[PDB]
Design an enzyme around this catalytic site. Structure first.
Site, PDB file in Angstrom:
ATOM      1  N   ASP B  54       0.830  -1.197   0.000  1.00 57.06           N
ATOM      2  CA  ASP B  54       0.000   0.000   0.000  1.00 57.06           C
ATOM      3  C   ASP B  54       0.868   1.252   0.000  1.00 57.06           C
ATOM      4  OD1 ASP B  54      -2.916   0.999   0.415  1.00 57.06           O
ATOM      5  OD2 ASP B  54      -1.782   2.076   1.952  1.00 57.06           O
ATOM      6  N   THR B  87      -3.804   4.720  -4.244  1.00 54.59           N
ATOM      7  CA  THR B  87      -2.919   5.585  -3.472  1.00 54.59           C
ATOM      8  C   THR B  87      -1.581   5.798  -4.172  1.00 54.59           C
ATOM      9  OG1 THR B  87      -3.953   4.526  -1.566  1.00 54.59           O
ATOM     10  CG2 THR B  87      -2.157   6.060  -1.156  1.00 54.59           C
ATOM     11  N   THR B  88      -1.053   4.766  -4.828  1.00 57.16           N
ATOM     12  CA  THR B  88       0.187   4.934  -5.579  1.00 57.16           C
ATOM     13  C   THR B  88      -0.041   5.655  -6.898  1.00 57.16           C
ATOM     14  OG1 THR B  88      -0.166   2.655  -6.294  1.00 57.16           O
ATOM     15  CG2 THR B  88       1.467   3.033  -4.577  1.00 57.16           C
ATOM     16  N   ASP B 391      -8.503  -2.464   1.687  1.00 55.22           N
ATOM     17  CA  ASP B 391      -8.581  -1.869   0.355  1.00 55.22           C
ATOM     18  C   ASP B 391      -9.727  -2.470  -0.449  1.00 55.22           C
ATOM     19  OD1 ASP B 391      -6.452  -0.243   0.936  1.00 55.22           O
ATOM     20  OD2 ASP B 391      -5.254  -0.842  -0.801  1.00 55.22           O
TER      21      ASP B 391
HETATM   22  N1  LIG Z   1      -5.847  -7.855 -13.385  1.00 57.32           N
HETATM   23  C1  LIG Z   1      -5.328  -6.679 -13.810  1.00 57.32           C
HETATM   24  N2  LIG Z   1      -4.918  -6.517 -15.085  1.00 57.32           N
HETATM   25  C2  LIG Z   1      -4.401  -5.354 -15.521  1.00 57.32           C
HETATM   26  N3  LIG Z   1      -4.249  -4.271 -14.742  1.00 57.32           N
HETATM   27  C3  LIG Z   1      -4.621  -4.293 -13.441  1.00 57.32           C
HETATM   28  C4  LIG Z   1      -5.192  -5.528 -12.891  1.00 57.32           C
HETATM   29  N4  LIG Z   1      -5.465  -5.279 -11.599  1.00 57.32           N
HETATM   30  C5  LIG Z   1      -5.101  -3.998 -11.343  1.00 57.32           C
HETATM   31  N5  LIG Z   1      -4.593  -3.413 -12.441  1.00 57.32           N
HETATM   32  C6  LIG Z   1      -4.096  -2.020 -12.540  1.00 57.32           C
HETATM   33  O1  LIG Z   1      -2.945  -1.833 -11.721  1.00 57.32           O
HETATM   34  C7  LIG Z   1      -2.934  -0.490 -11.240  1.00 57.32           C
HETATM   35  C8  LIG Z   1      -2.271  -0.418  -9.873  1.00 57.32           C
HETATM   36  O2  LIG Z   1      -3.224  -0.582  -8.830  1.00 57.32           O
HETATM   37  P1  LIG Z   1      -2.680  -0.684  -7.323  1.00 57.32           P
HETATM   38  O3  LIG Z   1      -1.288  -0.107  -7.323  1.00 57.32           O
HETATM   39  O4  LIG Z   1      -2.887  -2.086  -6.809  1.00 57.32           O
HETATM   40  O5  LIG Z   1      -3.636   0.327  -6.519  1.00 57.32           O
HETATM   41  P2  LIG Z   1      -2.997   1.372  -5.480  1.00 57.32           P
HETATM   42  O6  LIG Z   1      -2.445   2.454  -6.372  1.00 57.32           O
HETATM   43  O7  LIG Z   1      -4.160   1.791  -4.618  1.00 57.32           O
HETATM   44  O8  LIG Z   1      -1.950   0.579  -4.737  1.00 57.32           O
HETATM   45  C9  LIG Z   1      -4.378  -0.020 -11.219  1.00 57.32           C
HETATM   46  O9  LIG Z   1      -4.473   1.273 -11.821  1.00 57.32           O
HETATM   47  C10 LIG Z   1      -5.139  -1.030 -12.053  1.00 57.32           C
HETATM   48  O10 LIG Z   1      -5.746  -0.376 -13.168  1.00 57.32           O
HETATM   49 MG   LIG Z   2      -5.273  -0.590  -5.637  1.00 59.31          MG
END
Ligand SMILES: Nc1ncnc2c1ncn2[C@@H]1O[C@H](COP(=O)(O)OP(=O)(O)O)[C@@H](O)[C@H]1O
Ligand SMILES: [Mg+2]
Lengths: 52, 532, 195
Positions: B54, B87-88, B391
């Site tokens: 996170d 958040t990232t 989350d």
């Molecule tokens: N199964 C998937 N296939 C392709 N892209 C994905 C998948 N799951 C999540 N993503 C993408 O990865 C990106 C990173 O999300 P994440 O970093 O987990 O959220 P946060 O920024 O809250 O930590 C998101 O913008 C999402 O669009």
């Molecule tokens: Mg996420």
């Protein structure tokens, strides 16, 4: 320090003894609610006052 | 000549320094984005270890000195508070926006024009997202919630475990559903008590159809299982009665001392008898219980739990229908307790979880609550599971509240970049450049996603941009808006078909917050650092 | 060599920058020396008998279940007790009391047992005055114990615990959770029904 502002806004009059606590010293308001700011906090709002 | 006791940086120096700080913060967490992202293991220089993905947790744990970087850290914290996901992404987007804006400024473009272009681009991006890139969840059903939860839990320690964790999260969220005035279904997350305990595998995590208490009975003599529970929630300690500061006992006739001392405990004995006379089986109090009242409850064959947390007690009372009683006093001036104050549950059990015990309140009547017991291999994995579960719960809450979702895998970013690059040519002459740079900056998310998978980022993003350009130009091929990135094989893929969804509020709030952060940092052209 | 009465001018004003540059460091050094001298020189210059509960306390104890010196005490709450430890490597007697403090920290999480060498922080204090149990509460010295080996020996955790408790300095002692319960604390939007 906020007593003067509150009394000017709502229209209430401060009560310091229960003997003088009467209905005429209350301030009528249309709505008094506590609202949350999308998880960033809580705000107490008193919107709508007779004789504002 | 200034004679100011401190250091002063002016012009391109301070702007470059701020951009360096923002880029460093972005690079800290840029490696933990998307399913092919990997976690980080932080050490608190006292032996404490935190393994997490996170962004908000990482940025809060780190200590940051530069204030422009503190801006991004608290931006991530704000995004976590107001949304719970993305958040990232917001930090990365803000840093890229700042970098491109600084490039424009170094090209002798006035910062006011850049800020105006950024504002226009953000407004038009939000409008385009709302008008072209939203899918209603009404025609999808529970599959939409399941897919949103699975997408949220990707890039987390419960990724492949998603097939089970998504069902668990959806059931937990739907259990706590309630409707307020105006008939609005509001889902109150953070009411799902998350209990962690190392032990069995993640598949063994249990979703409680009731409430779970992290506390045990006060005395070993009391039974550890009551079938037809009558929960009595109290907010006062059950101890020997002690007079307040304003009351003092002075004895002149020695014959009254025994009566005084006896009444000191007979008051509490009478209170306990009054409580128990209504058929109460489980007694929960936020305060403490001494040995005397514990023995009273032992003899009656009833539960008695002390030092219960206030939030747990409130949730239990609301679910079981009980009423919190900070005191025993009716409006007649007497001291009475009636059966109408008793909550009910189908079972109360003190279960054993990995050499430790906790109390389970199963199947509360008049209201359904939920709790989750997370089983892991050690404390760190349980903490990471808890964060990822929070989350996912937040994502499901957003999806159920606002029934609009957006395609994942950077499809929205590519569509926005294409649309804004096309749109910039219709506004101004320098705000045109600002909007073009905003569109280019929005491409950082798919680039990072592709890079984290060790894929050819340039070719993949070029193909994605070509697909979205064809979708925007041809009005008979609008189904390509859902084409995103499939990081498993490194190919463009229809993410809406593949079931990769995110709440629209995540994208909207991230864009707005990143735009404000970039504007705030961009307004600075001079820094005075006073010596402490 | 006359004209001593000058009343000077804005010349010192023109050198306020360097004056304060040196004065801030001088003030920091003065603060460090004042915190060092609060103990040094101020203290350096000057069958129930068998404790039948000592064995049971011992067997339950094993149920485990320079600028930093200024900064860690300048901040944080004054309502908690900090027991600073002074030691130097090589001289015997430090390991025993280090282990005693380690054992005591398990049953007294409120206390903030910390260790710091003498070198990083005098010669007479280093030669034969290394073992010092500095107890800080509220920002001021409550316990100024030195030469503790004479009244302790060369002693388990029970001896140190008794020695500290007889003077009313150890906070009053107060279950094993699964691992944890709490995750956050805010307006968590508790359950409601509405009809
Ligand atoms: N199964 C998937 N296939 C392709 N892209 C994905 C998948 N799951 C999540 N993503 C993408 O990865 C990106 C990173 O999300 P994440 O970093 O987990 O959220 P946060 O920024 O809250 O930590 C998101 O913008 C999402 O669009
Ligand atoms: Mg996420």
């Amino acid at each position: 320090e906020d007593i003067e502002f509150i009394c000017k806004t709502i229209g209430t009059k401060p009560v310091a003894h229960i003997d003088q606590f009467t209905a005429d010293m209350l301030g009528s308001a249309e709505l008094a609610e506590e609202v949350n700011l999308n998880g960033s906090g809580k705000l107490l709002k008193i919107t709508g006052c007779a004789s504002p | 000549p200034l004679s100011v006791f401190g250091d002063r940086s002016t012009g391109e120096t301070i702007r470059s320094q701020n951009v360096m700080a923002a880029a460093s913060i972005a690079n800290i967490v840029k490696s933990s984005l998307g399913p092919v992202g990997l976690d980080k293991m932080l050490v608190d220089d006292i032996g404490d270890v935190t393994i997490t993905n996170d962004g908000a947790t990482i940025l809060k744990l780190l200590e940051v000195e530069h204030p422009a970087a503190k801006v991004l850290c608290e931006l991530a914290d704000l995004q976590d508070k107001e949304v719970g996901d993305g958040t990232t992404s917001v930090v990365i987007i803000a840093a890229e926006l700042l970098k491109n804006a600084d490039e424009l400024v170094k090209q002798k473009i006035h910062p006011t024009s850049v800020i105006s272009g950024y504002r226009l681009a953000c407004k038009e991006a939000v409008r385009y997202i709302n008008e072209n890139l939203i899918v209603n969840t009404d025609e999808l059903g529970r599959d939409c919630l399941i897919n949103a939860a699975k997408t949220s839990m990707s890039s987390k320690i419960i990724g492949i475990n998603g097939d089970f964790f998504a069902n668990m999260v959806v059931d937990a969220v739907l259990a706590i559903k309630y409707t307020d005035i105006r008939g609005q279904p509001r889902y109150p997350v953070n009411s799902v008590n998350i209990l962690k305990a190392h032990g069995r595998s993640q598949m063994e995590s249990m979703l409680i159809s009731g409430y779970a208490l992290n506390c045990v009975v006060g005395s070993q003599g009391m039974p550890k299982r009551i079938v037809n529970a009558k929960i009595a929630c109290l907010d006062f300690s059950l101890q020997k009665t002690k007079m307040k500061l304003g009351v003092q006992v002075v004895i002149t006739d020695p014959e009254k001392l025994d009566q005084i001392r006896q009444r000191e405990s007979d008051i509490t004995k009478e209170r306990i008898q009054k409580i128990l006379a209504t058929g109460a089986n489980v007694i929960l109090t936020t305060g403490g219980i001494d040995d005397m009242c514990l023995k009273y409850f032992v003899e009656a064959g009833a539960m008695a739990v002390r030092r219960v947390l206030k939030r747990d007690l409130k949730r239990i009372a609301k679910a079981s229908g009980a009423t919190i009683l900070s005191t025993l006093a009716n409006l007649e001036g007497e001291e009475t307790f009636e059966a109408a104050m008793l909550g009910q549950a189908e079972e109360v059990v003190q279960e054993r979880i990995c050499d430790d015990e906790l109390i389970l309140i199963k199947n509360t009547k008049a209201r359904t609550s939920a709790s989750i017991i997370l089983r892991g291999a050690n404390d760190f994995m349980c903490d990471e599971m808890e964060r990822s579960l929070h989350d996912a719960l937040c994502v499901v809450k957003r999806v159920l509240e606002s029934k609009s979702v957006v395609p994942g895998g950077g499809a929205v970013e590519a569509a926005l970049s294409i649309y804004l690059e096309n749109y910039a040519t219709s506004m101004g002459s320098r705000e045109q450049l600002a909007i073009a740079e905003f569109a280019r900056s929005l491409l950082v998310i798919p680039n990072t996603l592709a890079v984290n998978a060790a894929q050819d980022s340039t070719d993949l993003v070029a193909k994605l941009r070509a697909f979205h350009n064809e979708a925007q130009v041809n009005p008979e091929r609008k189904n390509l808006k859902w084409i995103g990135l499939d990081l498993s094989n490194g190919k463009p893929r229809d993410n809406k078909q593949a079931g990769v969804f995110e709440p629209t509020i995540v994208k909207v709030k991230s864009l707005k917050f990143a735009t404000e952060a970039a504007i705030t940092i961009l307004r600075i052209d001079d820094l005075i650092k006073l010596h402490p | 060599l006359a004209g001593e009465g000058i009343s000077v001018n804005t010349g010192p004003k023109g050198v306020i920058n360097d004056w304060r540059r040196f004065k801030q460091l001088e003030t920091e050094q003065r603060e460090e020396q004042c915190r060092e001298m609060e103990r040094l020189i101020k203290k350096l210059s000057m069958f129930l008998q068998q404790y039948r509960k000592q064995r049971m306390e011992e067997m339950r104890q094993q149920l485990h279940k320079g600028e930093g010196f200024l900064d860690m005490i300048d901040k944080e709450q004054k309502s908690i007790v900090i027991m600073v430890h002074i030691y130097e490597d090589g001289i015997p007697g430090t390991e025993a009391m280090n282990g005693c403090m380690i054992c005591l920290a398990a049953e007294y999480p409120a206390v903030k047992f910390c260790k710091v060498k003498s070198s990083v922080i005098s010669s007479q204090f280093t030669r034969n005055a290394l073992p010092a149990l500095l107890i800080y509460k509220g920002g001021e010295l409550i316990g100024n114990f030195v030469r503790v080996t004479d009244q302790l020996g060369d002693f388990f955790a029970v001896d140190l615990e008794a020695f500290l408790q007889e003077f009313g300095l150890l906070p009053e002692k107060e279950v094993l959770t699964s691992v944890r319960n709490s995750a956050t604390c805010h307006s968590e939007d508790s359950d409601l029904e509405i009809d």
